[PDB]
Amino acid sequence: ISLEDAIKASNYEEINNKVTDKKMAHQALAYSLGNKKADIALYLLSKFNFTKQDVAEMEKMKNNRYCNLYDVEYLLSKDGANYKVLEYFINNGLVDVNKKFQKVNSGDTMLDNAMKSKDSKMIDFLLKNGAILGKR
């Protein structure tokens, strides 16, 4: 099965066979965010030590449609199903809360996504961590 198929199926034996280093964990985390598999995302974050450098590398990934179309910060914040992953990334300092999107909705921030979705818990979490809206 493909890596994305294993993630969609929560097939941990196949995920653990396939994801042996951080380069593959980048792909796996992007597919987990794109498919709203927060369980698998947090599993990967418990197995590999993600850093700011890893986020930078995810922004340049080959052949991953989610990181091709979207900023990592957009993936973290567009769907409330990924809130615990957003929490991890902000609490561990892996992303700038006010990064301006470059690949989609250029100039927006994570708080723009949270406000649009009217996700009260995400809005409050972001505001508590200094979030502002994108400028123009």
Tab-separated table of N, CA, C and O in Angstrom:
chain	number	residue	atom	x	y	z
A	1	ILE	N	0.826	-1.205	0.000
A	1	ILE	CA	0.000	0.000	0.000
A	1	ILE	C	0.869	1.268	0.000
A	1	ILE	O	2.032	1.231	0.413
A	2	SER	N	0.311	2.382	-0.475
A	2	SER	CA	1.047	3.637	-0.463
A	2	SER	C	1.126	4.188	0.957
A	2	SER	O	0.381	3.777	1.850
A	3	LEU	N	2.050	5.132	1.153
A	3	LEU	CA	2.150	5.790	2.452
A	3	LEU	C	0.846	6.492	2.803
A	3	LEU	O	0.341	6.355	3.923
A	4	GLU	N	0.277	7.242	1.851
A	4	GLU	CA	-0.979	7.928	2.141
A	4	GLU	C	-2.092	6.930	2.436
A	4	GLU	O	-2.925	7.166	3.321
A	5	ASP	N	-2.124	5.803	1.716
A	5	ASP	CA	-3.143	4.798	2.001
A	5	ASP	C	-3.008	4.267	3.421
A	5	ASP	O	-4.012	4.085	4.118
A	6	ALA	N	-1.771	4.039	3.876
A	6	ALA	CA	-1.554	3.558	5.233
A	6	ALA	C	-2.026	4.584	6.253
A	6	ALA	O	-2.579	4.229	7.296
A	7	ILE	N	-1.789	5.862	5.974
A	7	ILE	CA	-2.210	6.911	6.889
A	7	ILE	C	-3.731	6.982	6.957
A	7	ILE	O	-4.314	7.043	8.047
A	8	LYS	N	-4.398	6.965	5.794
A	8	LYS	CA	-5.858	6.992	5.781
A	8	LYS	C	-6.451	5.810	6.531
A	8	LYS	O	-7.511	5.941	7.152
A	9	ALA	N	-5.780	4.660	6.507
A	9	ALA	CA	-6.285	3.456	7.151
A	9	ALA	C	-5.878	3.326	8.617
A	9	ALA	O	-6.267	2.348	9.264
A	10	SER	N	-5.077	4.261	9.144
A	10	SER	CA	-4.473	4.138	10.476
A	10	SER	C	-3.753	2.800	10.636
A	10	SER	O	-3.844	2.123	11.667
A	11	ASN	N	-3.032	2.412	9.586
A	11	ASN	CA	-2.290	1.158	9.557
A	11	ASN	C	-0.912	1.429	10.146
A	11	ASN	O	0.037	1.775	9.441
A	12	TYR	N	-0.800	1.262	11.463
A	12	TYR	CA	0.444	1.611	12.145
A	12	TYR	C	1.593	0.692	11.780
A	12	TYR	O	2.745	1.140	11.758
A	13	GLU	N	1.329	-0.587	11.516
A	13	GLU	CA	2.421	-1.465	11.104
A	13	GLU	C	3.058	-0.969	9.815
A	13	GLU	O	4.292	-0.940	9.685
A	14	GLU	N	2.234	-0.543	8.857
A	14	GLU	CA	2.770	-0.053	7.596
A	14	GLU	C	3.393	1.327	7.760
A	14	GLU	O	4.439	1.611	7.164
A	15	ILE	N	2.778	2.197	8.566
A	15	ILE	CA	3.405	3.490	8.836
A	15	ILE	C	4.781	3.301	9.475
A	15	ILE	O	5.762	3.948	9.072
A	16	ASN	N	4.888	2.397	10.460
A	16	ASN	CA	6.178	2.190	11.125
A	16	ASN	C	7.191	1.512	10.208
A	16	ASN	O	8.397	1.777	10.318
A	17	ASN	N	6.738	0.674	9.274
A	17	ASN	CA	7.684	0.113	8.313
A	17	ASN	C	8.211	1.183	7.368
A	17	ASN	O	9.412	1.218	7.070
A	18	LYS	N	7.329	2.065	6.882
A	18	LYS	CA	7.667	2.987	5.806
A	18	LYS	C	8.395	4.225	6.305
A	18	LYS	O	9.253	4.770	5.604
A	19	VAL	N	8.036	4.722	7.480
A	19	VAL	CA	8.533	6.016	7.935
A	19	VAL	C	9.715	5.740	8.851
A	19	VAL	O	9.568	5.553	10.063
A	20	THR	N	10.915	5.708	8.260
A	20	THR	CA	12.108	5.360	9.024
A	20	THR	C	12.981	6.549	9.374
A	20	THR	O	13.864	6.399	10.231
A	21	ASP	N	12.788	7.697	8.719
A	21	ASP	CA	13.599	8.870	9.006
A	21	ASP	C	12.753	10.118	8.855
A	21	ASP	O	11.584	10.063	8.445
A	22	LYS	N	13.351	11.259	9.200
A	22	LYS	CA	12.566	12.485	9.228
A	22	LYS	C	12.129	12.905	7.838
A	22	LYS	O	11.036	13.460	7.687
A	23	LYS	N	12.931	12.635	6.806
A	23	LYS	CA	12.516	13.007	5.459
A	23	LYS	C	11.186	12.354	5.095
A	23	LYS	O	10.276	13.017	4.578
A	24	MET	N	11.033	11.056	5.387
A	24	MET	CA	9.750	10.424	5.127
A	24	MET	C	8.692	10.885	6.122
A	24	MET	O	7.500	10.945	5.774
A	25	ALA	N	9.095	11.213	7.355
A	25	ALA	CA	8.124	11.718	8.319
A	25	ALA	C	7.526	13.042	7.860
A	25	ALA	O	6.373	13.330	8.184
A	26	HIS	N	8.291	13.856	7.116
A	26	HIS	CA	7.736	15.082	6.538
A	26	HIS	C	6.541	14.770	5.648
A	26	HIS	O	5.497	15.428	5.737
A	27	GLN	N	6.713	13.812	4.732
A	27	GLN	CA	5.631	13.381	3.854
A	27	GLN	C	4.454	12.864	4.660
A	27	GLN	O	3.294	13.220	4.405
A	28	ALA	N	4.741	12.019	5.645
A	28	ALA	CA	3.689	11.403	6.429
A	28	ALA	C	2.924	12.445	7.227
A	28	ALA	O	1.703	12.346	7.356
A	29	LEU	N	3.622	13.448	7.779
A	29	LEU	CA	2.906	14.478	8.527
A	29	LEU	C	2.019	15.303	7.605
A	29	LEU	O	0.880	15.610	7.966
A	30	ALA	N	2.513	15.652	6.410
A	30	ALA	CA	1.697	16.402	5.452
A	30	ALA	C	0.443	15.630	5.058
A	30	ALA	O	-0.651	16.200	5.014
A	31	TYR	N	0.577	14.329	4.779
A	31	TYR	CA	-0.603	13.528	4.469
A	31	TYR	C	-1.533	13.397	5.670
A	31	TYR	O	-2.758	13.319	5.500
A	32	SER	N	-0.984	13.345	6.888
A	32	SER	CA	-1.832	13.266	8.074
A	32	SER	C	-2.639	14.546	8.239
A	32	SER	O	-3.846	14.504	8.514
A	33	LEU	N	-1.999	15.692	8.048
A	33	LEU	CA	-2.729	16.951	8.137
A	33	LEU	C	-3.757	17.061	7.021
A	33	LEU	O	-4.908	17.445	7.263
A	34	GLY	N	-3.366	16.698	5.797
A	34	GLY	CA	-4.283	16.814	4.670
A	34	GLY	C	-5.502	15.920	4.797
A	34	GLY	O	-6.598	16.291	4.354
A	35	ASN	N	-5.350	14.748	5.412
A	35	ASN	CA	-6.452	13.811	5.604
A	35	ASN	C	-7.093	13.914	6.987
A	35	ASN	O	-7.918	13.061	7.348
A	36	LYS	N	-6.728	14.942	7.766
A	36	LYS	CA	-7.295	15.191	9.093
A	36	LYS	C	-7.146	13.986	10.017
A	36	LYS	O	-8.074	13.613	10.738
A	37	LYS	N	-5.953	13.376	10.009
A	37	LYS	CA	-5.643	12.235	10.873
A	37	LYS	C	-4.760	12.732	12.016
A	37	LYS	O	-3.543	12.510	12.048
A	38	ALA	N	-5.383	13.438	12.965
A	38	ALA	CA	-4.610	14.035	14.052
A	38	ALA	C	-3.927	12.981	14.917
A	38	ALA	O	-2.829	13.233	15.430
A	39	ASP	N	-4.551	11.812	15.090
A	39	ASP	CA	-3.929	10.702	15.811
A	39	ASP	C	-2.593	10.316	15.191
A	39	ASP	O	-1.583	10.132	15.887
A	40	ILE	N	-2.572	10.161	13.860
A	40	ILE	CA	-1.343	9.759	13.181
A	40	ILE	C	-0.318	10.883	13.240
A	40	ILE	O	0.882	10.641	13.420
A	41	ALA	N	-0.772	12.130	13.101
A	41	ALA	CA	0.144	13.262	13.205
A	41	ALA	C	0.844	13.279	14.561
A	41	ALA	O	2.074	13.404	14.629
A	42	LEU	N	0.078	13.133	15.656
A	42	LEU	CA	0.692	13.149	16.979
A	42	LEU	C	1.555	11.924	17.212
A	42	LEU	O	2.573	12.014	17.911
A	43	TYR	N	1.188	10.787	16.615
A	43	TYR	CA	2.059	9.615	16.655
A	43	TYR	C	3.409	9.912	16.012
A	43	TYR	O	4.464	9.583	16.574
A	44	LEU	N	3.399	10.544	14.837
A	44	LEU	CA	4.661	10.868	14.183
A	44	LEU	C	5.491	11.832	15.019
A	44	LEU	O	6.725	11.722	15.070
A	45	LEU	N	4.833	12.804	15.653
A	45	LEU	CA	5.549	13.791	16.450
A	45	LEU	C	6.116	13.176	17.717
A	45	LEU	O	7.051	13.738	18.302
A	46	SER	N	5.573	12.036	18.149
A	46	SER	CA	6.138	11.332	19.292
A	46	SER	C	7.322	10.453	18.915
A	46	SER	O	8.117	10.102	19.794
A	47	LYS	N	7.453	10.088	17.640
A	47	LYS	CA	8.482	9.182	17.136
A	47	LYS	C	9.677	9.921	16.551
A	47	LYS	O	10.800	9.396	16.573
A	48	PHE	N	9.461	11.138	16.059
A	48	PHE	CA	10.496	11.950	15.456
A	48	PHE	C	10.464	13.316	16.114
A	48	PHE	O	9.406	13.790	16.528
A	49	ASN	N	11.627	13.949	16.191
A	49	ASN	CA	11.767	15.243	16.853
A	49	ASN	C	11.698	16.324	15.784
A	49	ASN	O	12.697	16.665	15.159
A	50	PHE	N	10.501	16.861	15.571
A	50	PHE	CA	10.316	17.900	14.567
A	50	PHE	C	10.818	19.240	15.089
A	50	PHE	O	10.605	19.591	16.254
A	51	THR	N	11.481	19.989	14.213
A	51	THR	CA	12.102	21.269	14.531
A	51	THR	C	11.654	22.312	13.518
A	51	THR	O	11.002	21.997	12.515
A	52	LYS	N	12.027	23.571	13.779
A	52	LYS	CA	11.793	24.624	12.794
A	52	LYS	C	12.404	24.272	11.448
A	52	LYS	O	11.821	24.564	10.397
A	53	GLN	N	13.600	23.673	11.454
A	53	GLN	CA	14.217	23.269	10.197
A	53	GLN	C	13.350	22.264	9.443
A	53	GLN	O	13.268	22.310	8.214
A	54	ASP	N	12.694	21.342	10.154
A	54	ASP	CA	11.818	20.393	9.470
A	54	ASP	C	10.642	21.096	8.807
A	54	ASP	O	10.209	20.696	7.722
A	55	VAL	N	10.081	22.115	9.470
A	55	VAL	CA	8.989	22.871	8.864
A	55	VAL	C	9.467	23.523	7.575
A	55	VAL	O	8.786	23.470	6.546
A	56	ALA	N	10.660	24.122	7.608
A	56	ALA	CA	11.224	24.717	6.402
A	56	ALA	C	11.358	23.684	5.289
A	56	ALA	O	11.063	23.970	4.118
A	57	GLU	N	11.779	22.468	5.634
A	57	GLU	CA	11.927	21.428	4.625
A	57	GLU	C	10.577	20.951	4.102
A	57	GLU	O	10.456	20.614	2.919
A	58	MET	N	9.539	20.947	4.941
A	58	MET	CA	8.225	20.563	4.442
A	58	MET	C	7.709	21.551	3.415
A	58	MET	O	6.981	21.160	2.495
A	59	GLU	N	8.068	22.829	3.553
A	59	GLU	CA	7.611	23.811	2.581
A	59	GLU	C	8.175	23.564	1.191
A	59	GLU	O	7.643	24.117	0.227
A	60	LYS	N	9.211	22.731	1.059
A	60	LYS	CA	9.875	22.503	-0.224
A	60	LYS	C	9.776	21.054	-0.681
A	60	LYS	O	10.573	20.618	-1.518
A	61	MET	N	8.810	20.302	-0.164
A	61	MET	CA	8.740	18.874	-0.434
A	61	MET	C	8.358	18.590	-1.880
A	61	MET	O	7.546	19.295	-2.486
A	62	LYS	N	8.940	17.520	-2.419
A	62	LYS	CA	8.610	17.046	-3.754
A	62	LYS	C	7.436	16.073	-3.704
A	62	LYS	O	7.339	15.241	-2.797
A	63	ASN	N	6.537	16.201	-4.682
A	63	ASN	CA	5.470	15.229	-4.933
A	63	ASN	C	4.550	15.034	-3.731
A	63	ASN	O	4.037	13.935	-3.505
A	64	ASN	N	4.324	16.078	-2.939
A	64	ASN	CA	3.278	16.040	-1.922
A	64	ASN	C	2.284	17.138	-2.256
A	64	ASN	O	2.607	18.325	-2.134
A	65	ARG	N	1.081	16.748	-2.672
A	65	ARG	CA	0.142	17.748	-3.160
A	65	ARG	C	-0.253	18.727	-2.064
A	65	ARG	O	-0.545	19.894	-2.352
A	66	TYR	N	-0.249	18.290	-0.801
A	66	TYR	CA	-0.695	19.195	0.251
A	66	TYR	C	0.326	20.296	0.492
A	66	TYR	O	-0.037	21.473	0.592
A	67	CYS	N	1.608	19.959	0.538
A	67	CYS	CA	2.572	21.030	0.723
A	67	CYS	C	2.847	21.789	-0.569
A	67	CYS	O	3.288	22.945	-0.512
A	68	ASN	N	2.531	21.203	-1.726
A	68	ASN	CA	2.629	21.958	-2.967
A	68	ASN	C	1.585	23.069	-3.009
A	68	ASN	O	1.888	24.203	-3.400
A	69	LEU	N	0.362	22.773	-2.572
A	69	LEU	CA	-0.724	23.743	-2.643
A	69	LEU	C	-0.760	24.708	-1.466
A	69	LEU	O	-1.230	25.840	-1.627
A	70	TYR	N	-0.293	24.298	-0.282
A	70	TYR	CA	-0.587	25.033	0.946
A	70	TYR	C	0.651	25.239	1.804
A	70	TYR	O	1.485	24.338	1.934
A	71	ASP	N	0.723	26.404	2.444
A	71	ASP	CA	1.681	26.614	3.521
A	71	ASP	C	1.416	25.634	4.654
A	71	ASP	O	0.273	25.257	4.928
A	72	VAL	N	2.487	25.241	5.348
A	72	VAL	CA	2.315	24.413	6.539
A	72	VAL	C	1.358	25.073	7.530
A	72	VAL	O	0.510	24.401	8.129
A	73	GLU	N	1.478	26.394	7.720
A	73	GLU	CA	0.618	27.078	8.681
A	73	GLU	C	-0.839	27.091	8.234
A	73	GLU	O	-1.744	27.087	9.077
A	74	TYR	N	-1.086	27.091	6.922
A	74	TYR	CA	-2.451	26.944	6.431
A	74	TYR	C	-2.981	25.541	6.706
A	74	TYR	O	-4.105	25.389	7.194
A	75	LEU	N	-2.164	24.505	6.452
A	75	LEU	CA	-2.562	23.132	6.769
A	75	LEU	C	-2.874	22.954	8.251
A	75	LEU	O	-3.778	22.191	8.613
A	76	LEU	N	-2.123	23.626	9.129
A	76	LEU	CA	-2.333	23.468	10.566
A	76	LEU	C	-3.649	24.080	11.024
A	76	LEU	O	-4.223	23.631	12.025
A	77	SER	N	-4.138	25.103	10.321
A	77	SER	CA	-5.210	25.954	10.818
A	77	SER	C	-6.492	25.920	10.001
A	77	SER	O	-7.501	26.475	10.451
A	78	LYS	N	-6.496	25.314	8.817
A	78	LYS	CA	-7.691	25.418	7.985
A	78	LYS	C	-8.829	24.579	8.555
A	78	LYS	O	-9.984	25.023	8.578
A	79	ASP	N	-8.522	23.379	9.034
A	79	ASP	CA	-9.520	22.446	9.545
A	79	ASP	C	-9.341	22.280	11.045
A	79	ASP	O	-8.257	21.905	11.510
A	80	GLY	N	-10.412	22.514	11.800
A	80	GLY	CA	-10.328	22.350	13.236
A	80	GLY	C	-9.980	20.942	13.681
A	80	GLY	O	-9.562	20.753	14.824
A	81	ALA	N	-10.146	19.944	12.807
A	81	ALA	CA	-9.767	18.585	13.177
A	81	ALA	C	-8.286	18.472	13.505
A	81	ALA	O	-7.894	17.547	14.218
A	82	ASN	N	-7.462	19.396	13.024
A	82	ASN	CA	-6.027	19.331	13.261
A	82	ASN	C	-5.585	20.199	14.429
A	82	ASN	O	-4.391	20.469	14.570
A	83	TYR	N	-6.517	20.607	15.294
A	83	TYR	CA	-6.198	21.570	16.343
A	83	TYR	C	-5.070	21.085	17.253
A	83	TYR	O	-4.221	21.881	17.659
A	84	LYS	N	-5.060	19.799	17.628
A	84	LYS	CA	-4.010	19.345	18.540
A	84	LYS	C	-2.635	19.384	17.885
A	84	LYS	O	-1.618	19.527	18.582
A	85	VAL	N	-2.583	19.278	16.554
A	85	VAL	CA	-1.304	19.424	15.862
A	85	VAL	C	-0.889	20.890	15.831
A	85	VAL	O	0.283	21.225	16.051
A	86	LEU	N	-1.840	21.787	15.554
A	86	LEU	CA	-1.575	23.218	15.657
A	86	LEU	C	-1.060	23.574	17.045
A	86	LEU	O	-0.094	24.342	17.180
A	87	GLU	N	-1.702	23.030	18.083
A	87	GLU	CA	-1.276	23.264	19.460
A	87	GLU	C	0.174	22.863	19.651
A	87	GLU	O	0.976	23.621	20.208
A	88	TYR	N	0.525	21.664	19.180
A	88	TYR	CA	1.891	21.179	19.306
A	88	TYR	C	2.864	22.127	18.625
A	88	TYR	O	3.886	22.508	19.200
A	89	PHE	N	2.565	22.518	17.386
A	89	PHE	CA	3.497	23.346	16.636
A	89	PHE	C	3.688	24.721	17.273
A	89	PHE	O	4.808	25.248	17.297
A	90	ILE	N	2.619	25.330	17.786
A	90	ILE	CA	2.772	26.624	18.452
A	90	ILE	C	3.504	26.462	19.780
A	90	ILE	O	4.447	27.210	20.078
A	91	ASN	N	3.094	25.480	20.591
A	91	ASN	CA	3.713	25.309	21.908
A	91	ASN	C	5.186	24.949	21.813
A	91	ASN	O	5.960	25.298	22.714
A	92	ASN	N	5.593	24.245	20.757
A	92	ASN	CA	6.994	23.877	20.566
A	92	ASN	C	7.762	24.883	19.719
A	92	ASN	O	8.914	24.611	19.359
A	93	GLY	N	7.152	26.015	19.367
A	93	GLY	CA	7.865	27.069	18.663
A	93	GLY	C	8.245	26.728	17.244
A	93	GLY	O	9.213	27.285	16.717
A	94	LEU	N	7.506	25.833	16.599
A	94	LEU	CA	7.925	25.338	15.300
A	94	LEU	C	7.497	26.249	14.168
A	94	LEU	O	8.060	26.153	13.073
A	95	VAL	N	6.485	27.085	14.397
A	95	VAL	CA	5.993	28.027	13.403
A	95	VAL	C	5.800	29.371	14.078
A	95	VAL	O	5.528	29.452	15.281
A	96	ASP	N	5.933	30.424	13.275
A	96	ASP	CA	5.568	31.783	13.653
A	96	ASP	C	4.051	31.902	13.585
A	96	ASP	O	3.455	31.672	12.525
A	97	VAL	N	3.432	32.254	14.716
A	97	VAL	CA	1.978	32.343	14.776
A	97	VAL	C	1.450	33.309	13.723
A	97	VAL	O	0.339	33.139	13.217
A	98	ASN	N	2.245	34.316	13.354
A	98	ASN	CA	1.827	35.335	12.404
A	98	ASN	C	2.530	35.227	11.059
A	98	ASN	O	2.589	36.215	10.313
A	99	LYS	N	3.014	34.041	10.696
A	99	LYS	CA	3.511	33.853	9.345
A	99	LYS	C	2.435	34.190	8.325
A	99	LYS	O	1.278	33.774	8.448
A	100	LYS	N	2.816	34.965	7.322
A	100	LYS	CA	1.923	35.323	6.237
A	100	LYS	C	1.975	34.256	5.153
A	100	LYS	O	3.056	33.921	4.659
A	101	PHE	N	0.812	33.723	4.786
A	101	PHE	CA	0.777	32.647	3.798
A	101	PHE	C	1.334	33.114	2.456
A	101	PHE	O	1.101	34.249	2.028
A	102	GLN	N	2.068	32.220	1.779
A	102	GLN	CA	2.657	32.509	0.474
A	102	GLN	C	2.093	31.672	-0.665
A	102	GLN	O	2.162	32.108	-1.822
A	103	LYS	N	1.533	30.497	-0.379
A	103	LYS	CA	1.110	29.571	-1.422
A	103	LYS	C	-0.377	29.619	-1.698
A	103	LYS	O	-0.814	29.200	-2.778
A	104	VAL	N	-1.148	30.107	-0.743
A	104	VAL	CA	-2.601	30.109	-0.801
A	104	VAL	C	-3.054	31.283	0.046
A	104	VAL	O	-2.418	31.608	1.057
A	105	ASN	N	-4.112	31.960	-0.399
A	105	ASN	CA	-4.666	33.105	0.327
A	105	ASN	C	-3.551	34.023	0.808
A	105	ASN	O	-3.447	34.364	1.990
A	106	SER	N	-2.692	34.406	-0.139
A	106	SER	CA	-1.437	35.058	0.194
A	106	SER	C	-1.666	36.288	1.059
A	106	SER	O	-2.520	37.134	0.767
A	107	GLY	N	-0.915	36.363	2.146
A	107	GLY	CA	-1.002	37.455	3.076
A	107	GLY	C	-1.818	37.157	4.314
A	107	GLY	O	-1.639	37.843	5.328
A	108	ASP	N	-2.707	36.163	4.250
A	108	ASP	CA	-3.485	35.733	5.402
A	108	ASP	C	-2.578	35.070	6.440
A	108	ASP	O	-1.459	34.646	6.147
A	109	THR	N	-3.092	34.957	7.659
A	109	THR	CA	-2.428	34.274	8.765
A	109	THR	C	-3.339	33.187	9.316
A	109	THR	O	-4.507	33.076	8.943
A	110	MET	N	-2.797	32.385	10.242
A	110	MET	CA	-3.607	31.354	10.889
A	110	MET	C	-4.834	31.946	11.572
A	110	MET	O	-5.900	31.325	11.559
A	111	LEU	N	-4.723	33.154	12.130
A	111	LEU	CA	-5.895	33.746	12.773
A	111	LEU	C	-6.991	34.062	11.761
A	111	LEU	O	-8.177	33.960	12.095
A	112	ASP	N	-6.629	34.414	10.527
A	112	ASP	CA	-7.633	34.573	9.470
A	112	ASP	C	-8.428	33.293	9.271
A	112	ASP	O	-9.656	33.325	9.144
A	113	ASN	N	-7.743	32.150	9.212
A	113	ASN	CA	-8.447	30.884	9.059
A	113	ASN	C	-9.353	30.613	10.251
A	113	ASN	O	-10.504	30.193	10.083
A	114	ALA	N	-8.841	30.835	11.462
A	114	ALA	CA	-9.622	30.538	12.657
A	114	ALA	C	-10.844	31.437	12.747
A	114	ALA	O	-11.923	30.974	13.125
A	115	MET	N	-10.694	32.721	12.404
A	115	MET	CA	-11.841	33.630	12.433
A	115	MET	C	-12.892	33.220	11.412
A	115	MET	O	-14.092	33.200	11.723
A	116	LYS	N	-12.457	32.881	10.193
A	116	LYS	CA	-13.392	32.525	9.124
A	116	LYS	C	-14.196	31.301	9.497
A	116	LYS	O	-15.399	31.234	9.229
A	117	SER	N	-13.547	30.315	10.112
A	117	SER	CA	-14.236	29.102	10.509
A	117	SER	C	-15.035	29.265	11.796
A	117	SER	O	-15.761	28.337	12.162
A	118	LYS	N	-14.902	30.400	12.493
A	118	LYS	CA	-15.610	30.644	13.752
A	118	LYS	C	-15.325	29.534	14.760
A	118	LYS	O	-16.196	29.080	15.503
A	119	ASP	N	-14.078	29.085	14.779
A	119	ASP	CA	-13.640	28.027	15.681
A	119	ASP	C	-13.200	28.694	16.978
A	119	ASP	O	-12.082	29.192	17.075
A	120	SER	N	-14.081	28.708	17.980
A	120	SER	CA	-13.836	29.513	19.171
A	120	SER	C	-12.576	29.074	19.907
A	120	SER	O	-11.786	29.911	20.360
A	121	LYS	N	-12.373	27.767	20.049
A	121	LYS	CA	-11.205	27.288	20.780
A	121	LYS	C	-9.914	27.653	20.057
A	121	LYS	O	-8.930	28.042	20.695
A	122	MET	N	-9.896	27.514	18.726
A	122	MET	CA	-8.707	27.868	17.958
A	122	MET	C	-8.463	29.370	17.991
A	122	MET	O	-7.315	29.814	18.087
A	123	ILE	N	-9.525	30.166	17.851
A	123	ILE	CA	-9.391	31.620	17.920
A	123	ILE	C	-8.758	32.027	19.241
A	123	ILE	O	-7.784	32.784	19.279
A	124	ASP	N	-9.290	31.504	20.343
A	124	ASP	CA	-8.776	31.872	21.654
A	124	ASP	C	-7.337	31.416	21.832
A	124	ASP	O	-6.505	32.164	22.359
A	125	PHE	N	-7.017	30.203	21.378
A	125	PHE	CA	-5.650	29.707	21.513
A	125	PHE	C	-4.672	30.596	20.758
A	125	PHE	O	-3.609	30.962	21.272
A	126	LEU	N	-5.014	30.950	19.518
A	126	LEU	CA	-4.136	31.783	18.712
A	126	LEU	C	-3.971	33.176	19.314
A	126	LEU	O	-2.846	33.680	19.415
A	127	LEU	N	-5.077	33.799	19.739
A	127	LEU	CA	-5.001	35.129	20.349
A	127	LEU	C	-4.144	35.108	21.604
A	127	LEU	O	-3.357	36.033	21.847
A	128	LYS	N	-4.284	34.054	22.412
A	128	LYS	CA	-3.470	33.893	23.611
A	128	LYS	C	-1.980	33.845	23.286
A	128	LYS	O	-1.144	34.242	24.110
A	129	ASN	N	-1.627	33.382	22.088
A	129	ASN	CA	-0.245	33.262	21.649
A	129	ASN	C	0.180	34.395	20.720
A	129	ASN	O	1.132	34.231	19.957
A	130	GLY	N	-0.510	35.536	20.767
A	130	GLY	CA	-0.065	36.725	20.056
A	130	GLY	C	-0.491	36.827	18.609
A	130	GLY	O	0.050	37.657	17.862
A	131	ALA	N	-1.464	36.030	18.189
A	131	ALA	CA	-1.859	36.022	16.788
A	131	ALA	C	-2.504	37.336	16.383
A	131	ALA	O	-3.289	37.923	17.133
A	132	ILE	N	-2.211	37.763	15.160
A	132	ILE	CA	-2.885	38.889	14.532
A	132	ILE	C	-3.379	38.445	13.163
A	132	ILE	O	-2.976	37.405	12.636
A	133	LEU	N	-4.272	39.251	12.591
A	133	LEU	CA	-4.778	39.011	11.252
A	133	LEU	C	-3.745	39.454	10.227
A	133	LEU	O	-2.876	40.279	10.510
A	134	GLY	N	-3.836	38.886	9.029
A	134	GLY	CA	-2.957	39.315	7.962
A	134	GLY	C	-3.247	40.751	7.565
A	134	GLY	O	-4.373	41.233	7.670
A	135	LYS	N	-2.204	41.448	7.135
A	135	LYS	CA	-2.340	42.806	6.628
A	135	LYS	C	-2.448	42.789	5.106
A	135	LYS	O	-2.270	41.759	4.453
A	136	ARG	N	-2.755	43.953	4.543
A	136	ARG	CA	-2.790	44.106	3.092
A	136	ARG	C	-2.330	45.504	2.697
A	136	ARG	O	-2.172	46.373	3.554
